[PDB]
Design a binder for these strands. Structure first.
Length: 580
RNA sequence: GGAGCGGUAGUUCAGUCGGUUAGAAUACCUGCCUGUCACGCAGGGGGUCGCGGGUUCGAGUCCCGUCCGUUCC
C-alpha cells in the first residue's frame, strides 16, 4: 500500500524490480487483448501494461483518465521504447491495479504536457475556476516548483551570508496617503482598523536599528489599487535590509544572490557583474529606466544637429530623439508606432526613408542638410526608416522609447535570454505636478548622495539619490536604497518635500523617533518575487507562478471571494454597508 | 471610462448574408481489436443557441434592455 518509487522516475535501472506505484491515470489504450496505461505522478508518466491473465487486467479496463490508482507490477524493459518519455525505455507488468478514486472528466485536459506535448491553453477563466485541476498540468507544477527551488536557494544563500529571517507584521497602521491599503476592521472598537502591510519597509529598518545586522524575509504585500498591469491584490517580495552598507555593498550581494538563485533553480549562469546605467543613461539610450537590453535599437539625441535648421519643430525643441529601424516601414506600421508616441506624451512622430545619397518621405526635406551628421549618429543604412520624437527631453525619450519597444515586436526581434542591469544614480527628487513642489522620486527615507548633500538647498535638481532598480528584460524586479539614519538629514530632506511635523509625525512618527536611539547606516532592497518568477518562467503573467492567483478583478473564481457576509456578522464589527 | 469584440454540445467552434432536421472536431460512452504510446475501426449519448422583451410569414442568426467574457486606448 506504500508507493516505492514516484511513478515518473522509474528507469532502465529498475528493470526486474517488483514495484508499487500510486498516481493518476493519464490515458488508457485498450487494444483489447492488451491494455496500456500511462500512470502519472509529479515525477512523470510510466506506462503500466495489463495482460488478460493478470488480476490487474480486469481493473485496467474500467479505469479512466484522472482516476487515482495504486499499481503493483514488475519493471520490465520495453520492446520498443517511447523516445519522448523519460521512462520510455521501460514499463510495469501490472501484478495488480486498484482504484483509489474514480474521477469524472476534467473540464479541460491535463495530460499532453506530461508526454511533452505543447499543452493547449484553456481559457484563464476556466483554469482559475478549477485551479486544482489546472495545477495537475506539467507547466504549473514546474513553475510552482521553480518557485520553491528559487526561494529555497534564497534562504540557502542569505542564511549562509548571515542574514536573519524575520517575519514581519501583517496587521498594521493604515498610512495617511499614497498606496491605498486593505483594511481590517477592529471588532472591539468600531471605526478603528488594522492595515494589510504595503511592505516591510519600516519594520526592516527598525530591525537594523535593533542591532540585527542583515535581515531578509520572503514577505507578502498588499495594496488595494488597480490590478491594472499584471497586479494581484496582494503579492510576494524578497525583502532584504542591511546595516553598514554602501550602495556597492547592497548591489554586489544581490548580484551574487541572483546568480545563485539562477544557477540553482534554472541551472542558468548569469555572467557577472550585472551592468549598470545611470538613470540619465538609461533614459537617454533607451528612454526608460527599465531597459530591455535583449536588443539594441538605441535612441540618439540630435537636437543639436538642427539648431541651424529651418524646420521649426526640430530646432525649437528641447530634445529630438532619433531612432532608426532596420526596415522601410509600411504607412500602416509607421502609423501604429505613432500612436505609441502620442500615447506616451508626444506631439507626434516624424519619420523619413533612408535611400542612398539622401532621404525621402516624412520629414526628409529637412533631414537632408544634416544628412551626413545624422547618418553617423543613427548609424542608418539605406532602406532604414528614421523615426523622430521631438519635445521635452523626458517626453521625447519616453515616447521614442515606447516606440522602440513596439518596434522590437514589429521588426520581429526574437528577444531571448535574461538581461540584468542595475539602474543607478536616479535623481533624489523629481518634479512635474501642477502643485509645484519637489516630489520625492522614491521614498522619503531615501538617502541623498553624500556629495550632492550641499545641493539639497541650492540645487534640489542635480541631487542624486543612493537608490537603485534591478531590472530584468525591461522589467523592474528590484528596487532599493541606502537610507537616512541621521535624524537631522532626514529633517533637511523633509524641508525640500514641503513636509511638516504634522504629516511627519502622522506618517513616520515612531520611526523618526527610533532614529533618535542610534540608527546605523543602512538600506537594502526588495525583489518583486512574482514578476521575477514569471520572467524566469517565461509566463506572461505572474499568475502562472502563483498557486492560486485572483482574476483581473481580484476576484477568486475558484473560491467565490470577495463575498458578502451575514448582516449580523458585519454588525458584530460595528459597520454598515452604506451607499443608497 | 470608451468602444469593439464574444457568448451555440463536456471544450474549441461552425451553423454561410433570416427559412439548410444545430453540426464538426475533440472529449465522453458502448463494441471489437494482444505491443499501444494522439492506437485503430464501428456505433452511441450530450444543446436553457447568456437572460428578457422586440422586429418579422419564418430568429441561433436582426433590433433593444440587460448580464457575462475579452481586447486596444
Amino acid at each position: 500500500m506504500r508507493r516505492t518509487h514516484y511513478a515518473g522516475s522509474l528507469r532502465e535501472t529498475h528493470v526486474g524490480e517488483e514495484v508499487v506505484l500510486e498516481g493518476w491515470v493519464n490515458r488508457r489504450r485498450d487494444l483489447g487483448g492488451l491494455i496500456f496505461l500511462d500512470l502519472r505522478d509529479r515525477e512523470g508518466l510510466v506506462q503500466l501494461v495489463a495482460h488478460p491473465a493478470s488480476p490487474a487486467y480486469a481493473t485496467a479496463e474500467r479505469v479512466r483518465p484522472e482516476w487515482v490508482v495504486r499499481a503493483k507490477g514488475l519493471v520490465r524493459l520495453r520492446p520498443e521504447p517511447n523516445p519522448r518519455l523519460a521512462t520510455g525505455r521501460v514499463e510495469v507488468e501490472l501484478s495488480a491495479l486498484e482504484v483509489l478514486a474514480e474521477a469524472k472528466t476534467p473540464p479541460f485536459p491535463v495530460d499532453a504536457g506530461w508526454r511533452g506535448e505543447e499543452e493547449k491553453e484553456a481559457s484563464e477563466e476556466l483554469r482559475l475556476k478549477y485551479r486544482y485541476l489546472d495545477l495537475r498540468r506539467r507547466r504549473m507544477q514546474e513553475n510552482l516548483r521553480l518557485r520553491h527551488r528559487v526561494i529555497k536557494a534564497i534562504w540557502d544563500f542569505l542564511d549562509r551570508e548571515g542574514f536573519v529571517q524575520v517575519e514581519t507584521p501583517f496587521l498594521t497602521k493604515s498610512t495617511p496617503e499614497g498606496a491605498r491599503d486593505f483594511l481590517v476592521p477592529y471588532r472591539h472598537e468600531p471605526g478603528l482598523f488594522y492595515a494589510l502591510p504595503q511592505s516591510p519597509q519600516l519594520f526592516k529598518q527598525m530591525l537594523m536599528v535593533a542591532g540585527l545586522d542583515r535581515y531578509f524575509q520572503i514577505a507578502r504585500c498588499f495594496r488595494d489599487e488597480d490590478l491594472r498591469a499584471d497586479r494581484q491584490p496582494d503579492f510576494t517580495q524578497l525583502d532584504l535590509e542591511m546595516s553598514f552598507v554602501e550602495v556597492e555593498d547592497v548591489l554586489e550581494l544581490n548580484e551574487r544572490l541572483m546568480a545563485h538563485v539562477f544557477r540553482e533553480a534554472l541551472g542558468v549562469e548569469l555572467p557577472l557583474p550585472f551592468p549598470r546605467l545611470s538613470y540619465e543613461e538609461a533614459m537617454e539610450r533607451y528612454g526608460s529606466d527599465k531597459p530591455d537590453l535583449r536588443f539594441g535599437l538605441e535612441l540618439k539625441e540630435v537636437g543639436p544637429l538642427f539648431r541651424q535648421s529651418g524646420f521649426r519643430v526640430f530646432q525649437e525643441a528641447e530634445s529630438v530623439k532619433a531612432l532608426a529601424l532596420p526596415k522601410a516601414l509600411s504607412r500602416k506600421e509607421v502609423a501604429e508606432l505613432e500612436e505609441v508616441a502620442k500615447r506616451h506624451k508626444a506631439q507626434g512622430l516624424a519619420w523619413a526613408r533612408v535611400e542612398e545619397g539622401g532621404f525621402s518621405g516624412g520629414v526628409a526635406k529637412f533631414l537632408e542638410p544634416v544628412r551626413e551628421a545624422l547618418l553617423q549618429a543613427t548609424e542608418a543604412r539605406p532602406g532604414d526608416t528614421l523615426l523622430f520624437v521631438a519635445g521635452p527631453r523626458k517626453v521625447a525619450a519616453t515616447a521614442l522609447g515606447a516606440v522602440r519597444l513596439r518596434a522590437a515586436d514589429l521588426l520581429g526581434l526574437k528577444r531571448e535570454g535574461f538581461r540584468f542591469l542595475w539602474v543607478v544614480d536616479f535623481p533624489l527628487l523629481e518634479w512635474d505636478e501642477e502643485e509645484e513642489a519637489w516630489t520625492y522620486m522614491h521614498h522619503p527615507f531615501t538617502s541623498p548622495h553624500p556629495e550632492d548633500l550641499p545641493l539639497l538647498e541650492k540645487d534640489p535638481g542635480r541631487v542624486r539619490a543612493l537608490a537603485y532598480d534591478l531590472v530584468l528584460n525591461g522589467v523592474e524586479v528590484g528596487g532599493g536604497s541606502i537610507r537616512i539614519h541621521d535624524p537631522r538629514l532626514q529633517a533637511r530632506v523633509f524641508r525640500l518635500l514641503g513636509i511638516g511635523e504634522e504629516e511627519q509625525r502622522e506618517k513616520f512618527g515612531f520611526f523618526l523617533e527610533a532614529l533618535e536611539y542610534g540608527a546605523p547606516p543602512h538600506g537594502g532592497i526588495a525583489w518583486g518575487l512574482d514578476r521575477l518568477l514569471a520572467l524566469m518562467t517565461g509566463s506572461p503573467s505572474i499568475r502562472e507562478v502563483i498557486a492560486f492567483p485572483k482574476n483581473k478583478e481580484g476576484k477568486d473564481p475558484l473560491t467565490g471571494a470577495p463575498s458578502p457576509v451575514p448582516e449580523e456578522q458585519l454588525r458584530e464589527l460595528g459597520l454598515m454597508v452604506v451607499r443608497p
